[PDB]
Amino acid sequence: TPAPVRYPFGEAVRLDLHPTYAELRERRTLLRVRVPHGDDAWLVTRHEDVRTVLTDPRFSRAAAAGRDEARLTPLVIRTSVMGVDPPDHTRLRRLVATAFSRRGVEHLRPGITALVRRLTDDMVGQGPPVDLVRSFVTPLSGLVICDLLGVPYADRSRFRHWLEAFFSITALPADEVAVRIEAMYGYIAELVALRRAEPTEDLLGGLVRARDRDGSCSEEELVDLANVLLLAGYHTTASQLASSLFVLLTQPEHAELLRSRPELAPRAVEELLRYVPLIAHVTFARYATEDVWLGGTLVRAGEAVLPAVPSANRDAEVFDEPDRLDLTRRHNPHLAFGHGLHHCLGASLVRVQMEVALTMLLGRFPDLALAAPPDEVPWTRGMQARSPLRLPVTW
């Protein structure tokens, strides 16, 4: 076992990838690394190999609960269906799958479309400049998940505070991170209480009923599913949307090609998920439950692998000219939503939310450009997902 390399390679800056990722794919070897917290790990950079760590049966995500899990975050996160294996993974996903399928999300399309129109109504009337994050990205992603889940979006001034603590690598101290985590779990319980006495028609009303009526999940399990879907919908989705809007505003002909022929939106959304390296560095660690040889390494039983999914999204044996954004790319087998068993549940909700939002922003604002130099756009740091802090625009 080699001397561990400090991981992450450094602060992930803007939408840039550190050069070591490209070196590692070509070497075809895993990098023994020492991460800021938890066990030592093997970094996985190749697409062909990150697929294996993300979904192979010999790689466990539940067995990471019995370890000081290799991570960037100070405290280990209860990750709901993300931190479990079958059978519990099947049992937990079965309760939210149909509402997050392609069909169920298509039923949501008029509301997202109607909301995007109401948000773009707001910008049209107010005039430039607009911070697209405050006035478009956050309300659309925030109102969408709050409505589907049943969270009052009108309490966001309260859970946005706790929400960020779940993305923190270095931005928050350990005690503020744990304090925020408990506060969010308490408020989520405040929401589940209301569904016992006052059932609701939303994702939240339906899953408490499965707990009380079917015993399909535990109370901690119920709170876990509710928490990760608010984290994912309210923040992870907005980060990808603000990042994708930043990409299109700084490479404006790609914005102009999508605008002039808008029927490229499904590929353009897929390409935007592939090209933007949303993950600051790696996704959740897996631990081998037996020996798996990959990346020139015999990963032994109990050893951690860290999936560098954005590096796998630039893999040249898989995507041609992968460092160049191609909104017209037809076959786009990227891993921005994961791969296999833990493939992103809100995969379709992001697609419908992204394709509807980019198209109308372009359709309604054809002259839209950044109001500050692309380097002057502030970005989040010490967080698990990349996003601009603001997106000042003009049109």
Give binding residues for heme b as ranges: 89, 93, 283, 286, 342, 344
Rounded Cα gap, residues 386 and 384, in angstroms = 7
Range in contact with ligand HEM (rule: CB under 6 A) among 13-21, 41-49, 174-182, 229-237? 229-237
Q: Which does 311 bind (CB under 5 to 8 A by kind): ligand B9O, ligand HEM, none?
A: none
Rounded Cα gap, residues 149 and 229, in angstroms = 8
54 binds ligand HEM (CB under 6 A): yes
385 binds ligand B9O (CB under 6 A): yes
Residue 255 or 385 having the CB closest to ligand HEM:
385
Q: Which of 346, 357, 368, 370 binds ligand HEM (CB under 6 A)?
A: 346
Cite the annotated binding site by residue number.
89, 93, 283, 286, 342, 344
**Axis-axis angle for helices 347-364, 265-275 (nearest 10):** 110
236 binds ligand B9O (CB under 6 A): yes
Range in contact with ligand B9O (rule: CB under 6 A) among 77-85, 170-178, 285-293, 359-367? 77-85
Give me the torsion for CA of 350, 356, 361, 362, rounded to 10°: 110
The CA angle 283-281-388, to the nearest 5 degrees, is 110
Residue 40 or 88 having the CB closest to ligand HEM:
88
Range in contact with ligand HEM (rule: CB under 6 A) among 44-52, 69-77, 112-120, 231-239? 231-239
Task: Provide the minimum distance between the beta carbon of 349 and ligand HEM in the complex, in angstroms, as a whole number.
Answer: 5
Say which residue the tokens 């081998």 belong to: 288
Give the gyration radius of the chain's Cα atoms. 21
Tell me the CA end-to-end span of the chain in Å, nearest whole number: 56
Assess contact for 332 and 266: CB atoms under 8 A: no
Rounded Cα gap, residues 122 and 146, in angstroms = 20
- Total residues at interface with ligand B9O (CB under 6 A): 14
Strands 286-288, 59-60: pairing is antiparallel
Range in contact with ligand B9O (rule: CB under 6 A) among 3-11, 40-48, 73-81, 205-213? 73-81
Amino acid at 141: S
82 binds ligand B9O (CB under 6 A): yes
Range in contact with ligand HEM (rule: CB under 6 A) among 35-43, 167-175, 225-233, 366-374? 225-233
Which of positions 261-280 make contact with ligand B9O (CB under 6 A)? 279
Residue 104 or 128 having the CB closest to ligand HEM:
104
- Angular region, 393: left φ>0, alpha ψ -120 to 50, beta rest: beta
228 binds ligand B9O (CB under 6 A): yes
Binding mask 265-294 for ligand HEM (x = CB under 6 A): --------x----x----xx----------
Of the candidates 321, 332, 315, 325, which has an alpha carbon nearest to the alpha carbon of residue 45? 315
Q: Cis link prior to 129 (omega < 30° from 0)? A: yes
Q: Which of 79, 138, 359, 380 binds ligand B9O (CB under 6 A)?
A: 79
Contacts of 240 (CB under 8 A, 6+ apart): 272, 273, 276, 278, 336, 350, 354, 385, 387
As given in the structure block, the two tokens for residue 126 are 């107010």
Q: Which of 64, 77, 115, 358 binds ligand B9O (CB under 6 A)?
A: 77
Contacts of 23 (CB under 8 A, 6+ apart): none
Rounded Cα gap, residues 368 and 385, in angstroms = 25
Interface positions with ligand HEM (CB under 6 A): 54, 81-82, 93, 145, 228-229, 232-233, 236-237, 240, 273, 278, 283-284, 309, 336-338, 341-342, 344-346, 349-350
Interface positions with ligand B9O (CB under 6 A): 77, 79-80, 82, 166-167, 228, 231-232, 236, 279, 283, 384-385
